[PDB]
Ligand binder design. Sequence first.
Ligand SMILES: [Zn+2]
Ligand SMILES: [Zn+2]
Length: 51
Amino acid sequence: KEEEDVICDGCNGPVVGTRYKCSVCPDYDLCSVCEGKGLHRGHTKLAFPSP
Ligand SMILES: [Zn+2]
Ligand SMILES: [Zn+2]
């Protein structure tokens, strides 16, 4: 199988639970830990679940 996984651009770890996808930068995502630490705060992100 091919699976589409989300990798955090802050820490390169898995994004499980809620994902924070940048609405400006292409193909850019933070995990909840990196989002809470304030990385990449200069752009609006979309917060939604991460199956
Ligand atoms: Zn992270
Ligand atoms: Zn961005």
